[PDB]
Scaffold this active site. Structure first.
Site, short mmCIF file in Angstrom:
data_model
loop_
_atom_site.label_atom_id
_atom_site.label_comp_id
_atom_site.label_asym_id
_atom_site.label_seq_id
_atom_site.Cartn_x
_atom_site.Cartn_y
_atom_site.Cartn_z
N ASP A 138 -3.70 -0.05 -0.99
CA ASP A 138 -3.46 0.98 0.07
C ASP A 138 -1.98 0.99 0.44
O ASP A 138 -1.66 1.24 1.62
CB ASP A 138 -4.34 0.76 1.29
CG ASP A 138 -4.39 1.95 2.24
OD1 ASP A 138 -4.01 3.07 1.79
OD2 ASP A 138 -4.80 1.76 3.41
N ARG A 142 3.08 4.65 5.40
CA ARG A 142 2.39 4.39 6.70
C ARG A 142 2.07 2.89 6.81
O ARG A 142 2.07 2.38 7.89
CB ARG A 142 1.13 5.23 6.90
CG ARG A 142 0.03 4.98 5.88
CD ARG A 142 -1.29 5.73 6.09
NE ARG A 142 -2.12 5.54 4.89
CZ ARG A 142 -2.15 6.34 3.81
NH1 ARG A 142 -1.41 7.44 3.75
NH2 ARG A 142 -2.91 6.03 2.78
N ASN A 143 1.82 2.20 5.72
CA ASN A 143 1.40 0.79 5.75
C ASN A 143 2.60 -0.13 5.48
O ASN A 143 2.37 -1.26 5.05
CB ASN A 143 0.27 0.54 4.75
CG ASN A 143 -0.96 1.26 5.21
OD1 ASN A 143 -1.12 1.42 6.41
ND2 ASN A 143 -1.78 1.73 4.28
N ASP A 156 -1.38 -3.59 6.59
CA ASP A 156 -2.73 -3.01 6.38
C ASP A 156 -3.33 -3.57 5.10
O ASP A 156 -3.32 -2.88 4.06
CB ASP A 156 -2.73 -1.48 6.38
CG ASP A 156 -4.13 -0.93 6.62
OD1 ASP A 156 -5.11 -1.60 6.21
OD2 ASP A 156 -4.24 0.16 7.23
#
Ligand SMILES: */C=C/C(=O)Nc1cc2ccccn2n1
Length: 305
Positions: A138, A142-143, A156
């Protein structure tokens, strides 16, 4: 036949820390005082709301398992868990939030040196995960979190999976998934490797170089597998020399073993980071600059045996 995982899982009393304010919805900015240590550690406290979802509790404890077992400057540090009604994860506070939000907010103030150093730091993070036989599954802008403008960390680990003794690829069965970041072999056959992680590294770099644009914006996720099958890829960002884009494009090869290794990405981006204006062309790049508290220590200077 695998190495035992002797990571420590630290259990914290709820009295060891104070919620100062709310960051997301829950996640709190707070302060952690380890039991009789005379240090204050700025923390982000991820507290389950539902708590009566047994499934939810298995999910949060997998995150905690994975974050306890990683120790690298470019990967988020877990400090401990608290086993109250609501299970709380205590992590190093990453004050400037996600790199995705940070490049959107600061499009105008970000020079080539910062973009390329971010590309290196995330490559170091991902190479370390690979050393630990860990597939993130993932990776996305954003992570990745911002401790300072100079220093980012992969976060994350919700979807992260360890490969087994001889488990080269990993096999999964459903959920809400980030199609627009996934390798072709992942979308079609739920195959995930370090090399599928390199595909997503490619997309993460495209997000940074476009200052947070949405990949395949206004294209349905159902279409993505066909588009990649047709050999279409994300377009060359305006700021990117062909040298930077060619690296992104190699991460998006159909032959997974034809993609670069994270170790090679560290090297190529470092070479480019040594001469940033040769590799990214940004308007006014040359004029670009970014950034009781007595016993405050950053978690990076708080080490446990
Ligand atoms: C990598 C640990 C972490 O979760 N830290 C963190 C999360 C978060 C959300 C919003 C603002 C700041 N943050 N730091």
């Amino acid at each position: 036949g695998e190495a035992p995982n002797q990571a420590l899982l630290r259990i914290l009393k709820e009295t060891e820390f104070k919620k100062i304010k709310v960051l997301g919805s829950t996640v709190y900015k707070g302060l952690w005082i380890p039991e009789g240590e005379k240090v204050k550690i700025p923390v982000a406290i991820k507290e389950l709301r539902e708590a009566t979802s047994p499934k939810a509790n298995k999910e949060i404890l997998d995150e905690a398992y994975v974050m306890a077992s990683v120790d690298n400057p470019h990967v988020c540090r877990l400090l401990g868990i608290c086993l109250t009604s609501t299970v709380q994860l205590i992590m190093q506070l990453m004050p400037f939030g996600s790199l995705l939000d940070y490049v959107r907010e600061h499009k105008d103030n970000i020079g080539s040196q910062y973009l390329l150093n971010w590309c290196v730091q995330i490559a170091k993070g991902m190479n370390y995960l690979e050393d630990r036989r860990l597939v993130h599954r993932d990776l996305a802008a954003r992570n990745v979190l911002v401790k300072t403008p100079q220093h980012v960390k992969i976060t994350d680990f919700g979807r992260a999976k360890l490969l087994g003794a001889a488990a080269a690829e990993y096999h999964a069965e459903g959920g809400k998934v980030p199609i627009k970041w996934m390798a072709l072999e992942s979308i079609l056959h739920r195959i995930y490797t370090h090399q599928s992680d390199v595909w997503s590294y490619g997309v993460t770099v495209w997000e940074l170089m476009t200052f947070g644009s949405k990949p395949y914006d206004g294209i349905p996720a159902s279409e993505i597998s066909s588009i990649l099958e047709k050999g279409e890829r994300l377009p060359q960002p305006p700021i990117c020399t062909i040298d930077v884009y060619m690296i992104m494009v190699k991460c998006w090869m159909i032959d997974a073993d034809s993609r670069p290794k994270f170790r090679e990405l560290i090297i190529e981006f470092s070479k480019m980071a040594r001469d940033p204006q040769r590799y990214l062309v940004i308007q006014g790049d040359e004029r670009m600059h970014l950034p009781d508290m007595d016993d405050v220590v950053d978690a990076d200077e708080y080490l446990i045996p």
